[PDB]
Structures are given as structure tokens and as C-alpha cells.
Design an enzyme around this catalytic site. Structure first.
Site, PDB file in Angstrom:
ATOM      1  N   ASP C  48     -24.364  -6.568 -10.872  1.00 38.30           N
ATOM      2  CA  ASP C  48     -24.392  -8.097 -10.458  1.00 38.30           C
ATOM      3  C   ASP C  48     -23.488  -8.030  -9.676  1.00 38.30           C
ATOM      4  OD1 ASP C  48     -25.355 -11.105 -10.077  1.00 38.30           O
ATOM      5  OD2 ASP C  48     -23.887 -11.510 -11.587  1.00 38.30           O
ATOM      6  N   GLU C 127       8.048  -0.793  -6.821  1.00 40.03           N
ATOM      7  CA  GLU C 127       8.772  -0.748  -8.217  1.00 40.03           C
ATOM      8  C   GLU C 127       8.101  -1.594  -8.753  1.00 40.03           C
ATOM      9  OE1 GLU C 127      12.652   1.623  -5.925  1.00 40.03           O
ATOM     10  OE2 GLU C 127      12.662  -0.859  -6.131  1.00 40.03           O
ATOM     11  N   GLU C 129       7.914  -4.130 -11.840  1.00 35.76           N
ATOM     12  CA  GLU C 129       9.017  -4.384 -13.133  1.00 35.76           C
ATOM     13  C   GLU C 129       8.096  -5.456 -13.693  1.00 35.76           C
ATOM     14  OE1 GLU C 129      13.536  -4.820 -11.052  1.00 35.76           O
ATOM     15  OE2 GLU C 129      12.302  -6.735 -10.556  1.00 35.76           O
ATOM     16  N   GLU C 210      15.795  -3.908 -17.896  1.00 34.64           N
ATOM     17  CA  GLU C 210      16.193  -4.613 -16.685  1.00 34.64           C
ATOM     18  C   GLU C 210      17.002  -4.907 -16.918  1.00 34.64           C
ATOM     19  OE1 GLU C 210      16.746  -5.731 -13.796  1.00 34.64           O
ATOM     20  OE2 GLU C 210      15.772  -3.517 -12.082  1.00 34.64           O
ATOM     21  N   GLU C 218      11.340  -1.293 -16.435  1.00 32.38           N
ATOM     22  CA  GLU C 218      11.127  -0.950 -15.704  1.00 32.38           C
ATOM     23  C   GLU C 218      10.692   0.637 -15.718  1.00 32.38           C
ATOM     24  OE1 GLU C 218      13.300  -1.666 -12.223  1.00 32.38           O
ATOM     25  OE2 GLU C 218      11.956  -0.782 -10.760  1.00 32.38           O
ATOM     26  N   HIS C 267       9.395  -3.672  -5.282  1.00 35.36           N
ATOM     27  CA  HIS C 267       9.623  -3.636  -4.501  1.00 35.36           C
ATOM     28  C   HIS C 267       8.756  -2.414  -3.619  1.00 35.36           C
ATOM     29  CE1 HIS C 267      14.116  -4.136  -5.147  1.00 35.36           C
ATOM     30  NE2 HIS C 267      13.414  -5.388  -5.897  1.00 35.36           N
ATOM     31  N   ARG C 337      22.083  -6.583   0.338  1.00 34.20           N
ATOM     32  CA  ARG C 337      21.182  -7.290  -0.839  1.00 34.20           C
ATOM     33  C   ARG C 337      20.667  -8.619  -0.707  1.00 34.20           C
ATOM     34  NH1 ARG C 337      19.076  -2.948  -5.494  1.00 34.20           N
ATOM     35  NH2 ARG C 337      20.015  -1.460  -4.704  1.00 34.20           N
ATOM     36  N   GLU C 355      12.501  -0.244   2.481  1.00 31.94           N
ATOM     37  CA  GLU C 355      12.366  -0.984   1.372  1.00 31.94           C
ATOM     38  C   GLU C 355      12.237  -2.599   1.101  1.00 31.94           C
ATOM     39  OE1 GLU C 355      15.340  -1.757  -1.844  1.00 31.94           O
ATOM     40  OE2 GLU C 355      13.667  -1.492  -3.441  1.00 31.94           O
ATOM     41  N   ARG C 357      11.232  -5.364  -0.132  1.00 36.73           N
ATOM     42  CA  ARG C 357      11.828  -6.264  -1.188  1.00 36.73           C
ATOM     43  C   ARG C 357      10.730  -7.455  -1.793  1.00 36.73           C
ATOM     44  NH1 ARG C 357      16.640  -3.125  -3.714  1.00 36.73           N
ATOM     45  NH2 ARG C 357      17.096  -5.131  -4.208  1.00 36.73           N
TER      46      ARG C 357
END
Lengths: 466, 466, 466
Positions: C48, C127, C129, C210, C218, C267, C337, C355, C357
Site C-alpha cells: 500500500d 561524515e 556525527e 566529538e 563519530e 560534511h 574553516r 568538502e 560542510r
């Protein structure tokens, strides 16, 4: 002018404007005494209609509160001196009287009575019963529901441990009819209710404990003309609710709070009159006029529709169940208390009348009384004969011919449906409009739905192990 | 001089100097009556500016508290006889009137009105609603947050066990509109609030329970000229807060304390006048002048910016949500209560006015009223036509043309941003300075941030198992 | 056939059919192993559709579950031997692949990649977490709401009394990055998660505690082709959730469960390839190909729309707030960063990649990865240049030019709206249909509403005394 003098005589600081909604619940709003002027009486005060259930919708919110100066009475509970003034709800500009205002509707019905010339005044003597408890708890959510009642008189407390000891003199189940104190714990309170009721214009005839354990009680008041009596009912409830609150109790006019003991009913004694003579006395059955009989016939013909107003709650039907004393058989008699219509046997023909027994206190005064009248009138206008009086027995044995004689509605939905179909007699004289009726029905169907859709505790007992 | 006689007449021991901060919160400082001399009135008293949020910074702390002798009124709660005197905040030496002082700003706006010659006085009739609770608990820390509300009227308490028994007559959800006591538990308290409000110079028109369960209530007061009315709002709140406290309750003017039931609004009735005549009555729609319409147009044009002052809290937007009765549609009508601008239908043209419905009680009186005026004036000066009145329906169905007609801001940030961009109409006449506006915005953004950055309980329900 | 042998080799009693809904939550249904036959693989099983949120409506309920034999893996937790087989949702008869099936959508996107000939495979290395707690409590009703978090590692427990004594070695706020046990209480559990993840086909690269107090952890896994990686994410979450449960904990992938400490991000490392060569290595910035740069440009151009899939919860935006390390600036860099796009500096050009983020673990694997790809491709097809890399600083000071450079959406609504408007790049290749997109948006708006409409605890702190 009488009002403006009552303001000075009692040094009134506020005026509490009261009215009733479709369901029958008294509502109020307060204004300082200094806001009461000449204008006030001729044009009233403005308020939002859309706020009350079943009234104006999205576009036409504003309406008028018209003070009825004849109703002025001091509130005996408020801390600051305040005067209560009942109001009618009028359409703005036209100042007519809102189609959905129950008091206007009741007034319209008294008018139509005089108009048909059948009589000039209607007499109502309702007998509302009620319960006085100490604790009432209830709730309903996704994971369950419950209701718990408690009172010092409840028979179940014969085993309860109390701080200062259990003094144990309690009315057993169905054993409340008149044991003197201390079994009857409500003498002082019933009298305060009486005194206060009279301070508010009612005339008390008697007070006593009723049948059920756990605080069923009754204050009997003298009849009055239809609309003034419905006003009295509202005051009556107000006094009961508030005196109870002041005594540390909580009162309810629900018709059947407990399974297994008496419910609360509101028998309605009625009679018609013209130029001081009782149009109900005669040479026919039990001292009745043929007019009375047609009236009865009307009530019987439209019983199921009247039910929608006289027994407006699903709970109402938990009182009206095949029981012995259940006022469910649509018939009349001067003895058979199986009959929903009793004929009081009295000497003075001046006091001849009928007693319709199935109404309960949850009923809107106004609408219930009105529907009773209109059904009676339609019984007259159309000379609807009653048939013969039932003097045999109730619902059980009989059970001969399966005893399917007339009966009151067996559920709220059924009653609402009857009201839907059998609405003509109410629309007569333009008293009830279709819109009003349809709105009322919609309000109650929403209530009926809650009960129909929510699992009942007993269903678990009966089907959990299915 | 009247003040110096009130000091002797009431044997005053203290004088409580009051003022309002940018957020709208009344503040105070007290001095012994013997400190009141001739100097006091002409030069006021000195105090530290840097202490109030959003006021003077690092270098220019000191400022002046200028008593306004017209505001003298006795405090009805303090134990020792004390006289309250509202004050304006003036720049030292210049004695001008601080750019950031909300009362000065409101006065400036009344001045600018007279200056443009458009009218000589502005009339404000706000209707702040509020809640009365028994218990309010809340907190937020790294490991969580919460808020718990409790009141004897809360419908949720239908199941609560009480020491002396649950007396259970409570207003259900959205069922507070007028059941008489005991369902309405606040009659005595609403009247004390009324009496006290009047002892403090306000004129009360009515009081009643509002829609929400759990103690929503309202005291309606007579309008007054803009700045005097904002003063009245402050007194109003003060009386409400303190009478509640004295009765063992706690009151809040937050706009939406509960999800699922009514929020509290502060409708604002407005009208302009010159030499005693009502500049808002006319032959146009619903009895309006074309001036009124331009005013409305102004309010509608600058609604989002006004929001930043009339709905200054993130909570404000939990009341202004796509709901049925949500006063969020930027339009006018005499009926459609979907429209944030209602036109009261009244007989006397002397009472013709408009009702802007979206404001809430959290609003700074001064700044909210001022912004409403300035928007109205800019609507006039620039003959901003309103367009046609909406008499159809609200936000839901409609949903035809996706019904994207004007609407009020949907979040505080949005409102703050509107205020940022659309600030010209406020700077007119030098009423609002950029600095004042930017400071106000900064104060609120800090508040907006707390709410935006702190995890919400509902986010766990919605995303913990993500 | 490999499946039919795994059934005998492991004496499988059941087959657990799994799939993902629009929100990203893995779903399942189980059938006895004996129900697995030849038919099963060619025609799947019926179920269904109307039962899953945002799928088929009133008329077209039935759909097909198509087992993907490549996904067969044993469940390590169930008591009875059972084999898990991931399934795609196909339209009946046509056996096409439901427009709203996230796995079908992700497959379509991998197809379109090969079709444009830009590359033959996409590589994703997310990645995610997460947090491990001991107690999580929350609720919301009319009278309030709350959330309470608790874990033996929570810094707040430094003062808590414990049955056997407080052993007190806990990670302070933001102090979880690598203290060896006993401060880090999750070594044994992180490894079980690793071992189990590998038993289920994942390849683990590392595991560690972490930053946040109270159990942020992580497990880093090796990248894989886009659709297989989203499958891995689902398994990953499953392992995390269930190993935690077996250890007496409770894990959450919510992005910001606590105000004041780290949120959880996901990330996403990406790169493209053709015939074994890395299409992202080159002579341009940091070792990148010009293709990589166009990809980045695409991601930046459509960031706000990607947000609606990569940060699909209101909670997501409590992590993406003007903070220092907040991956909110739409720019690239190999160091800064502050930039939501980092360029890993690595030696082997075979490992060159980007990457992104800002994604969080609440994101639907499938839809998030797909949207990232499509944005990248549109960046290529239209040679959207990135501009120059930001190597300066984040959101705070800067604050020079008010630093209004690109940024990710600041609220869910904003992101949903972006997705609405900026949908073309997703519809490319017929990967995302309008219906799918509109349905997704509707699901999330309902969630956004709960949070927007429910009073927040902090609002009481901020406005109760208003």
C-alpha cells in the site's frame, strides 16, 4: 427609573448583563454602573455575535444586547455591589430579536399564543433536580478516559478512611428519600439556596433530598409565566451552582451522572389561561378540559422532536432507558407513573394542569418550554385526540403485545432527526426559523459525535479479550 | 501646586518617579516626599542613562528625569503613602527630550500632527487582553528547556486531584466567552482591577472573561488622546499585574502563551479630530471620510514596519498565523473579521473610527501608537488610496488565487527588516531618529536570536529519531 | 542466486525488506524466507502506497517493492536469522521507478551523470556525527512543552548524586575532542559500531569522540559511489541506533540538540571520475581541475535549494547560525574553516576532492546527495565560475563591508522557498519531478509549522513579564 433608583439604593458599582446561548448556558459581561444611562435602555450595548456557538458567522458579527429593565436583581455572591440585568439579543438597526436568541424565541412563542387567541398566558412549573458532590474528575485523551465522582454521602464511602474518622451515616443507593440528618447532609445548604433564590425573586415551595445516594437534591419553586420561568430556571441554576461552590461543593444538572442510581429530571407542569380562568379544567378525564387533552395529544405527537430540546444531551438518554419509573411511555394517566404525562389529582379546578415528566435539567429553558407549548398548540389547532389513558403498567410486563406503544426518543441523534423532520409545528407563527433549528441541530451533532467516536470504558470490559 | 497639595492631603511619604524603556516596560525610582521642591519641577532629577537597555553608551551616561505634574496619582498598593509621577527623559542642559525616550517620541508625534494641520488631536482606544494564571514555570539551559502553565481554570485540570476536592466547573478550550460563575472564576478580580484602574484615572467601559481556557480576561477602558492613552496602558498593566499578585495570581500580557487556544491581542481604535469635530466621519464607505481612507491606506502601506512595534516579540507571530480569525489580512471591512482593519458600524458620526486589529499587548504603547499615527499621516499627505474593502473571506478558502493579498509580517525578523527599510514615514517631522530606530532594532534582534538559536522542544518530537 | 545461497548458508528464517521514505527514514516489512522465490526478484511484492507520508493519495494506492539482490546483508540484531534486502519502489505494471522514491531518484541522478558524459561515477564521502544519551524526554501540550537531555558524560552532572557515587571524569562543554578514557566513556561502544558496520559491508576509517559534552561521537567510513553510499548511511544510522539501544543508550542524528555546544554535521566529500581517473585533479587552485571549480560554482549557486534537502529540519538552522566555525559562508578555501566548502590538501592527485560542510545528518541520503550532484553538474554544463577563494575570515570581523557575501539559507522556510523557485537544475534529466518536489516541500512545511506555531520556552523568559 426603578433601575436607576436600585443603583443608588444599593450603591451599585457594576451591572452584570446576562443572556443565554443556544445550549442553554447563561452568559455575562459587566459594565461599571456609571455606564448606565438613558441611551443604554433604548439602544442597548454592542457586542460580537461570532463569539457564541451557533450564532453569527464570518460576515455579520455585530449584534445588540438589549437590557430588560424588568429583570433587575442584585447579585448575592459578587464582592462589589452589582446589579444583574437580563438582556435580549436584537438584530442591529432593525432591533428585532435575533432568530437564534432563545429568549426572543420564547417571547415569540408567548406572543403567538395570544395571537391564536387560544389563551393569553402559559404557565410553567418545572422541577429541576440536581446533584451536590465534593470532587468531580474526568478526562479523555488518546490513551484513555475516565470519570470519578465523589461525595461524603456516597454509599461507597462507607469503607473510606477519613482524617477525623468516618462518621458513617450515609444514604444508601436509591435510599436518599428523606432520612433526617445526619444521613441527609444537605439541610443547611438547601435552605441557603432557598433564601437566596427568594432574594432573587423566586418563590420557593419546598426543598428536600432526592432519591440517589451521593447528594441528589431538589428545590421546588412556584410556577410562573413561561418566559419568566425560564429566566427563573437560569437564576435557579446560578444560585445552586454558586451556593454549592461557596459551601465547598460542586453541583451538576447533568441528567445521569451515575449508572445504578437515580438520574435528575425536570418535570414540567403546564396549563393555559385566559382572563384569569384556567383553560385546562373541565368535565373530561380527571378534571380536564378538552383543550388540555388536545394539548397532550400535541405533546405526544411531537415528543421525539421535543426531546431534542428537553433532553439535549447524549447523557439524557441514560436516564430515559427501559426502567420501571422511566418516564418514557408516551401516554397520560393520573396514577401510572410509567406514563411520561401525569395528571395531578387536585381539588381546586383553578390548579388543574398536566405534568410532562421526560424533560431533564440540561434542557435550554427557553427552547424546551417553547417546544412544549408549540406542540401543545398544534395539538389544539388540529384537535389531536390523545386516545385513552394508560392505567395498566410500564415497560416491563406489560411486554404482552411487545408493548410497542408510543415512546420518547431513545438516543440524541434520533431526537435530533425527529426535530429535523417534524419542524413545522415549531415554525408556526414564525417562532422558530429553519436556520435556528438547523444551527441547534448542528451544535448538538458535534456533541453527539464526541460520545459516539470515543471508546467507552465499558467497551474494554466487554471486548478487550475479544 | 496641585501636586504639593496632594502631598499634604494624602500625607505622602514618597514619590515614585516612573518612566518607560524602549521595550515598553515601566520603570521607577523613589524619593522621599521631602525631596520635592520648586527645583524638582523645573530642572528634574539626574540619573544614569547607561543603565537602561538601548540608551546612552560608554561616554554620555547622565540624563534628566523630568516630572510631568499632570500625571500625579496615588499608588494603591504600596504600604506607605506614595505618589506616582510619570516623567519624560530629557537631554541635560538642552532639556530637550531624549531621542530614544518613547514618551518624548510619542509627544513629538502628537506635535507633528498639529503642525501638519491635518488635525489637532489623535484618539486611541486600545483593547489589551491578558491571562491570569496560578503557576508559571520556565527555564532553558544547555541540557534542555521548558515552560509549564497552570491555572485553576485550565481545562487540563478537569482530571487533577485537589486537596479539598476538584470542584470542576472550568471553561473548556476556546470556551471562555461568558459562562457565568463559577465557570468564570474571575468576576471579583476583574472588578477590583476596574475599581483600582478608575482610582488611577482610567475610565472603564466593561470587563469580561475572554475566549481562552485558563484565565484569559479583558478590561475595556475608554479611549483618550494618544500619549495620555499610552500612559493609561502602562497604568493598566500595572494594575492588572499587581491586583493579580495580590489575589495570588500572576498575569501576563504575552501574546500567545498557549498553542491551541486564543492569543491576546490589543486592537487599536483610532480617529482624528479638529476643533471638536470627528475628521473621520463622511459620506464614503461605512460612514467614513476620505481622510480616514487615506489613513487606512497608510497603515496598510507600512503594516510590516508597524509590526516591529505593535508585535515586537517572536511570540507575537505565534498569534498571527494563518488561522481563521487571525487579523492578518491587510484590508478593511465592516464585517469580514479576517481583515486586520475593522470598521465599527455605529450610528453617531461623532463615534466613527477605524480598528486596527493586529497589535498585541507586548507592544510599547508609545512607539506602537506613534508608528500607527505616522503611517496614517503619510497615508493622508500622500493620498494613499486603500483600494476596495474585502468582504469575502479570510486566509483559507479563499486560497483561490493563492490569495496573496497584503499581509502583516510573518516573523519578527521580517518586521524588523521592514522597519529598517521603510523608516522614512517615521522620521518625518523628526519624530523618530535613525539612531533610535537602529537601537530598537538591535534590542529586538538580540531577543530574536535567543529564540532562533535555542532548540525547541517540538524539534525533538519532530527530529530526535531522524 | 547468491541470495538463495545466503539463505541456506545462514539458515535464514526471515527476509527484512527495506526502503526509505521522503523524509529519509528507513522503513521495513518482513516475510518468511520461504516466500522468496524466482517471482519475487522479477516482479517484487505489492504494498500500500497511501500509507507512507507524501506518497500516493486517495486513488492510486498500490505499488511495487522491488528487491535489489545486490544489497543482501544479515541483520546483526534480530533474534531469528534474517536477511535484509533493500528495495526500490516501482510503479505497478510499468515497473518504472516511482517519482517520489528517493532511491529511484538517486539512481536516476547517477544515470544522468553518465548520460551527459561528464563522468561515469560520483564519489560521496559523508561524515555523519551523532549523540549518545542515557535519557531523552520531551513533550508539548496546550499547557506547555519541554525537552530534557541526560547523559553520564554531560558536564552538568558534575554535581549529580549517583547511587554508587559520582566518579566524575566528564568532558566539559566543547571539551570532548579526544580526552582518553575514562573521560571518554564511549570507546567500547564506538568499536562495536565499527565492527558491526563492517559486518554489514561498510568500511571504517576511524572513530572518535566529538567536541560536545554529553556523548557526541563519530564513526568515519570510506566513501563509495553516490547511491551505494546513501544506502550505507541508512545502515550506518541503523547500526548506531541499535548498538546504542543494546548498550542502554539512545542515539540521535538531530543537528542541534543543545544550545551552547556543538551541533552534529554531515560534511560531504565529493569528486567525479571517468575510466578510473579523478576528474577533479588539475593545475588550478589547490590541485583542482576546472571541472571541480564549475562544480563548486554550481553548489554555491544552488546552495539555498540544496539546504532544503541537506538541512531539512528547523533544528538544522540552529547549527547554521552566525558562529565562528559555522559552515555558513558560501565560499571555498583550503584553510579558512569559515567556508562551507573546504578543499582538502592531499598529496596524491587521485584523492583530490571538495568538502561541502553545511549538510547535517537529518538529511535524506538520497535526496541530499542527488541535489548536491545536480547542482554540481549544472555548474559544469553552464561553466559557472566560483570566483576567488576566501582565505580571510568568517562571519565576525570580517563585518567590514557588513560582509554580505553568499550565505546558506537561514531558516527552513527560506530553504524550502529557494527549492521551490530554483528547481530547474533538479528537474534536469527528469531526475526530480515537480510533483515530487512539491510533495517534499509540503511535508516539511507541516513540520516547519509546528515549530513556528508552538510557544517556545524562551519566549516566556523573554516576554512573560511584558
Amino acid at each position: 427609573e426603578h433601575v436607576l433608583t436600585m443603583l443608588n439604593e444599593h450603591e451599585v458599582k457594576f451591572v452584570d448583563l446576562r443572556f443565554t446561548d443556544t445550549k442553554g448556558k447563561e452568559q455575562h459581561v459587566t459594565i461599571p454602573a456609571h455606564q448606565v444611562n438613558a441611551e443604554f435602555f433604548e439602544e442597548g450595548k454592542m457586542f460580537d455575535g461570532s463569539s457564541i456557538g451557533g450564532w453569527k458567522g464570518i460576515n455579520e458579527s455585530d449584534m445588540v444586547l438589549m437590557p430588560d429593565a424588568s429583570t433587575a436583581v442584585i447579585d448575592p455572591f459578587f464582592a462589589d455591589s452589582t446589579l444583574i440585568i437580563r438582556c435580549d439579543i436584537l438584530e442591529p438597526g432593525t432591533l428585532q430579536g435575533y432568530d437564534r436568541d432563545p429568549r426572543s424565541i420564547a417571547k415569540r412563542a408567548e406572543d403567538y399564543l395570544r395571537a391564536t387567541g387560544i389563551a393569553d398566558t402559559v404557565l410553567f412549573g418545572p422541577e429541576p433536580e440536581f446533584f451536590l458532590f465534593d470532587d468531580i474528575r474526568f478526562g479523555a485523551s488518546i490513551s484513555g478516559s475516565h470519570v470519578a465522582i465523589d461525595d461524603i454521602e456516597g454509599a461507597w464511602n462507607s469503607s473510606t478512611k477519613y482524617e477525623g474518622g468516618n462518621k458513617g451515616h450515609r444514604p444508601g443507593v436509591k435510599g436518599g428519600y428523606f432520612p433526617v440528618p445526619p444521613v441527609d447532609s444537605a439541610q443547611d445548604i438547601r435552605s441557603e439556596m432557598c433564601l437566596v433564590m427568594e432574594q432573587m425573586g423566586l418563590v420557593v415551595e419546598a426543598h428536600h433530598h432526592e432519591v440517589a445516594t451521593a447528594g441528589q437534591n431538589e428545590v421546588a419553586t412556584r410556577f410562573n409565566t413561561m418566559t419568566k420561568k425560564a429566566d427563573e430556571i437560569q437564576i435557579y441554576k446560578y444560585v445552586v451552582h454558586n451556593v454549592a461552590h461557596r459551601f465547598g461543593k460542586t453541583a451538576t444538572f447533568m441528567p445521569k451522572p451515575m449508572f445504578g442510581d437515580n438520574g435528575s429530571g425536570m418535570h414540567c407542569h403546564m396549563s393555559l389561561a385566559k382572563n384569569g380562568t384556567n383553560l385546562f379544567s373541565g368535565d373530561k378525564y380527571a378534571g380536564l378540559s378538552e383543550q388540555a387533552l388536545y394539548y397532550i395529544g400535541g405533546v405526544i405527537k411531537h415528543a421525539k422532536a421535543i426531546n431534542a430540546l428537553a433532553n439535549p444531551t447524549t447523557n439524557s438518554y441514560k436516564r430515559l432507558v427501559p426502567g420501571y419509573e422511566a418516564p418514557v411511555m408516551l401516554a397520560y394517566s393520573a396514577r401510572n407513573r410509567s406514563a411520561s404525562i401525569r395528571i395531578p389529582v387536585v381539588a381546586s379546578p383553578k390548579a388543574r394542569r398536566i405534568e410532562v415528566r421526560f424533560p431533564d435539567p440540561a434542557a435550554n429553558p427557553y427552547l424546551c418550554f417553547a417546544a412544549l407549548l408549540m406542540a401543545g398548540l398544534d395539538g389544539i389547532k388540529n384537535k389531536i385526540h390523545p386516545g385513552e389513558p394508560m392505567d395498566k403498567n410500564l415497560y416491563d410486563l406489560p411486554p404482552e403485545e411487545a408493548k410497542e406503544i408510543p415512546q420518547v426518543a431513545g438516543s440524541l441523534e434520533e431526537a435530533l432527526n425527529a426535530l429535523d423532520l417534524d419542524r413545522e409545528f415549531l415554525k408556526a407563527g414564525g417562532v422558530f426559523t429553519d436556520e435556528a433549528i438547523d444551527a441547534y441541530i448542528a451544535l448538538r451533532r458535534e456533541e453527539d459525535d464526541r460520545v459516539r467516536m470515543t471508546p467507552h470504558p465499558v467497551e474494554f470490559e466487554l471486548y478487550y479479550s475479544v
